Amino acid sequence: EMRPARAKFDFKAQTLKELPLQKGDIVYIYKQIDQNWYEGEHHGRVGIFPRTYIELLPPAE
């Protein structure tokens, strides 16, 4: 049920809840927490990042 996504831009974390991302990173989303933020994981670490900074990826064959 986790949704794959790829970062379209760098995202700098400014709070201890946020997950930093580098453009091109593949991340996995658990849920949407509010209008602007997803909660997800990168390399097993959980945090939040912006909806608009990622693209949702299609399923693998």
Partner: peptide, 10 residues
């Protein structure tokens, strides 16, 4: 270059 940054959740 990146999209407008959203504020942290309420």
């Amino acid at each position: 270059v990146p999209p407008p940054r959203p504020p942290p959740p309420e």
